[PDB]
Design a protein around this ligand. Structure first.
Ligand SMILES: C=C(C)[C@@H]1CCC(C)=C[C@H]1c1c(O)cc(CCCCC)cc1O
Ligand SMILES: C=C(C)[C@@H]1CCC(C)=C[C@H]1c1c(O)cc(CCCCC)cc1O
Ligand SMILES: NCCOB(c1ccccc1)c1ccccc1
Ligand SMILES: NCCOB(c1ccccc1)c1ccccc1
Lengths: 619, 619
């Protein structure tokens, strides 16, 4: 268990002229008086130690006397910090105590400047900075990393901590002091910068969103005038993302939306992304920026939303522009490939159904052999394509992206059984055929009127059905074992465990026997136990029905269009790569315009019409 | 792709003493200074060109320099417009540049006056009008026409555009200027007048409704004093409608309600429609106006609501008065025809059932032959009536209006089979019989206690059932093909595709086999595939049930009375024409009263009692 960093009740632990112990030092510093600090210098120069040694620190963490001074800050000002740092300078230690930090696993690197910044005191921050404290000390402990349980994640920097805490004066003093200037370009471990730490502390609540949007714009505006020669929104962390991509991956929708369509009028225009070129009543035409939003480059916002994301908000980022217009422009160009692919799959499935039906038992024979050869070639091509897709991609939207493989694999496996002349090529093949018709359902995603209907009608969750089936199946097996064990002595029904399981399952499709057998010694108890099974199956079925109804009473129904748009987006980004043998050359979208200053950016126009805002701007 | 009409970033395109190119002209006009316009006149008189030629315009659209001047309007005033028009006048061109307009397809006819009116600047409008610009220039491009996608529909006139934008000062200046007076009577393409364009931009939202009601009343009041000799609410567009009928057709309920019962006290009384004659406590008697609201004339509000309308708000216009009282007065007079028609149909159906039941296999014989003759005559009369109804009418309310035809057609077709002595007159006839009993259900619309019950009990949508049946039927056919293909090799059930389809459908009515067949080589896989079919049919049925319940949970239930009133209104307006052989003379309803001034109007009194408003007017 990690010790607390300061505690008024639990004392510190030493576990790793006059005598002046560390306990008296902590006692006089915690109260906060400088008169009783006399005699420290003479004692240190007699014992030939330094104030940052192992004697004067909590050995379990590494907390020095200065951090106890700052942690006992009363009314924002401590009168002991200045003489303590002065006598530390007079001691002549090589390692300065102002920038000392802990060495424990929990609070590694946690300096005094972080404590002074968190205590919302500009005076202690000024006293620490003016006495030679570096402003790039990283807090690398487990307590300052994003994980479940007890943690407070910030960007492991004094400036990041000042940014996450909404205090503006401390951010300004760190950014433009003469004694020790910080930098917005400085990075911690995991590669994050201060524009990343704001994104990773965002939330979908409106207050936290307003906080992080305001402070993100503020830091970007100060980065415009402090270090204009560097693009602050293009520095990459160790995963390879940028702040826009990191907003896309984590599921933070609000700061992602604000970053995607921010606009500042005036001198701060060159760092905008949404430029409006004309507007006529309700219609407004805006030139959005496709820098790392299109799929022509490497991992971008579209692919990160499509594949590398696990969040319930991955279906609402697609709807907001300029992702909606971009994916609509991609779909209106690549719908022909989808329809031709669907027609080829339908022709392959028709020839499969013909071969499976008109088949001899164990010109027409030559036609059927050509059909078998064509089925084998189609199955091996589909198998190669699906194995390519999995190997490149190294969850319900991927559901139909695995069954294809089964409809491939079984098929080719069935055909090698046909080449082995066994008596099992007929089940697996026709089993494949059943799966194949189910596998056609994915191709409803390409048409509007049936795609919206499919997304609207999928009103049950798969995990609920697969849990209920498992519970009912264990129930059936247990009662089947009991019924076989009960009916062994004659005065025959329920002879084996499988037959008794079938005759028990027959009560769910609606045809059960339920009578005196007149062949069993214990036929009354058999009837009683069957009555118990019926009365329990009805409770289980009613519970499942009630649970599904309670699930479907209270949810919003507007997500149908968003989910359909996401499914179409995944299919578009899949087809944009091309086939595994005819790799499609990626076509850059947008036009290279000149906005501001020679600032040449890729731009993409969208024409949005909205009568409500136009009615609002009217008198 | 159409080019933008102005764009600060994308430059214009030429695609269709000192030199003074069009690029320098656009550069100096866009900034907005007049000092650098010097030397233009000498250059134009040396090169013998004009300022509106092809050289000085964006050839892709036809945009002139003046429209670039107005589109770069800063703080409402440009100092360049006045010298530009002055030097255009000094150039001596035959075609004036002030009223020049585009010639592209997308922005056809879009003048500078439209831009100045949209920019909400009275000063630029005054400068354009005073320098000789006609006020009847029509914007005929696709961008200014009502269609899906990107469009801004107004009445293609400067006055209509000033009317749709809620600005009052520009409307007044266009209406009463001495330099170039506009007119409320002027019409664009599609025949619309200014009062029509207000209706076609209306909406059911309260803010837009309040805007359009206020501005409609305002323009009507100004039309009272500018051009009193013309009725502004009687001009017909090219479809033949008036503003009231256009409000009825499009589904705009709020402006339709306001137009139907507007009243102004004082000097503006003669243009009202609802006159109150007396009011005593709560009861109030009002003389509404039946000008184009009754069905005695040509296409009126009642017929346009009844037939020529496709909107979800066609069942709420009937409930609001004076349509409610009018249709109640029609129904209380024409209920006898409905009941006599129902009794005649019931007698015809009883004789049909008797003939279908007491029929010999392949005095009583003469009676049955007379019954057959009467069935043939009734069927041919009903067929002639229904063919008349379709040919004159050249959707669920029309559903029962087609099945009659089938109950006609099959019947007469069955009888000609009886005259052909074939072995198929017995199925079709009795099939007709079944349909006819279903065809009786439409006649529940005439009685209150069962009509409200029928409208209340119709709680399912037909398209959902017809989609679910299609999905389940494809499912059944696919599994039937698989089951026939699997069971071919003996060690018999499931022999043909139709029999296997029937034995698979038997799991839905609640009687399935589900056992080891002991006759098939692959009987275990047959059992497994039947289990798969059962487990999938239950998922599909549960999904359909959940979807219907979710559609049922969250909806308003007050629409039963409105839908029943609409159905009764459709039946009344159908019977008012009369039979196809005894065309009923149309009877004018209301009385010819004299209200205001000799203003003789058809009027219809309604007695409305409402305790709530009377409680509000009390202290
Ligand atoms: C309302 C339910 C869920 C069913 C509806 C069908 C009928 C006949 C019985 C009801 C029922 C009970 O009312 C109570 C139990 C629990 C007692 C089990 C004793 C072994 C089971 C049980 O199926
Ligand atoms: C709760 C439902 C919808 C039914 C209720 C009746 C019973 C016995 C089974 C349930 C059920 C599953 O719980 C899961 C599936 C999907 C797995 C199919 C495997 C081929 C189907 C499936 O009918
Ligand atoms: N009064 C004789 C039956 O009328 B029905 C009826 C009677 C009173 C109130 C409402 C309806 C009726 C019964 C079943 C279906 C439809 C109508
Ligand atoms: N148009 C032919 C059938 O299309 B379907 C359809 C038609 C119109 C609107 C919506 C869907 C369809 C029917 C059942 C299931 C899925 C789709």
């Amino acid at each position: 268990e990690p010790p607390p960093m300061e505690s008024p009740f639990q004392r510190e632990d030493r576990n790793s002229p006059d005598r002046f112990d560390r306990d008296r030092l902590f006692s006089v510093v915690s109260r906060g008086v400088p008169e009783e600090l006399t005699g420290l210098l003479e004692y240190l120069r007699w014992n030939s130690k330094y104030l940052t040694d192992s004697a004067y620190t909590e050995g379990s963490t590494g907390k020095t006397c200065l951090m106890k001074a700052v942690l006992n800050l009363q009314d924002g000002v401590n009168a002991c910090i200045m003489p303590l740092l002065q006598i530390d300078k007079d001691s002549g230690n090589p390692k300065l105590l102002v920038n000392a930090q802990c060495t424990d696993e929990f609070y590694q690197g946690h300096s005094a400047l972080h404590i002074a910044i968190e205590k919302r005191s500009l005076q202690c921050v000024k006293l620490l900075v003016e006495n030679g404290a570096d402003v790039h000390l990283r807090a690398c402990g487990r307590f300052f990393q994003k994980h479940q349980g007890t943690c407070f994640y910030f960007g492991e920097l004094p400036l990041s901590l000042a940014a996450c805490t909404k205090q503006w004066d401390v951010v300004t003093y760190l950014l433009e002091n003469p004694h020790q200037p910080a930098s917005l370009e400085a990075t911690d471990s995991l590669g994050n910068t201060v524009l990343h730490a704001l994104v990773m502390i965002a939330d979908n609540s409106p207050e936290n969103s307003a906080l992080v949007i305001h402070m993100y714009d503020g830091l970007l505006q100060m980065g415009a005038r402090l270090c204009p020669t560097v693009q602050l929104e293009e520095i990459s962390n160790h995963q390879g993302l940028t702040p826009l991509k990191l907003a896309a991956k984590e599921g933070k929708i609000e700061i992602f939306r604000h970053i995607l369509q921010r606009e500042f009028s005036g001198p701060y225009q060159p760092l905008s992304r949404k430029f409006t070129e004309w507007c006529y009543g309700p219609v407004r035409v805006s030139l959005y920026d496709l820098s790392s939003v299109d799929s022509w480059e490497k991992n971008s916002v579209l692919e990160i939303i499509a594949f590398h994301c696990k969040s319930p908000n991955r279906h609402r980022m697609v709807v907001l522009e300029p992702l909606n217009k971009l994916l609509q422009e991609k779909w209106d160009r690549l719908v022909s490939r989808f329809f031709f692919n669907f027609a080829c799959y339908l022709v392959y499935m028709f020839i499969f159904t013909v071969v499976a039906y008109h088949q001899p038992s164990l010109f027409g024979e030559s036609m059927l052999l050509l059909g078998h050869i064509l089925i084998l070639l189609g199955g091996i091509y589909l198998l190669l394509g699906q194995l390519w897709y999995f190997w490149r991609r190294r969850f319900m939207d991927s559901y139909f992206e695995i069954l294809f493989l089964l409809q491939a694999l079984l098929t080719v496996l069935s055909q090698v059984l046909r080449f082995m002349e066994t008596e099992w090529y007929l089940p697996l093949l026709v089993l494949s055929l059943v799966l194949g018709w189910l596998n056609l359902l994915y191709y409803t995603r390409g048409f509007q009127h049936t795609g919206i209907y499919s997304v609207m009608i999928q009103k049950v969750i798969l995990r609920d059905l697969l849990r209920f089936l498992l519970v009912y199946l264990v129930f059936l097996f247990g009662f089947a074992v009991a019924l076989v064990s009960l009916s062994r002595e004659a005065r025959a029904p329920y002879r084996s465990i499988l037959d008794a399981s079938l005759e028990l399952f027959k009560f769910t499709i609606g045809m059960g026997e339920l009578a005196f057998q007149e062949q069993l010694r214990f036929r009354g108890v058999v009837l009683l136990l069957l009555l118990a099974y019926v009365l329990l199956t009805y409770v289980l079925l009613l519970n499942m029905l009630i649970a599904l109804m309670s699930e479907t009473v209270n949810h919003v129904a507007d997500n149908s269009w968003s989910i359909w748009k996401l499914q179409k987006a995944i299919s578009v980004l899949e087809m944009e790569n091309g086939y595994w043998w005819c790799r499609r050359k990626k076509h850059r979208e947008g036009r290279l315009l000149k906005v501001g200053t020679p600032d040449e950016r890729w731009c993409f126009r969208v024409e949005e019409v909205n009568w409500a805002a136009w009615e609002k701007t009217l008198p």
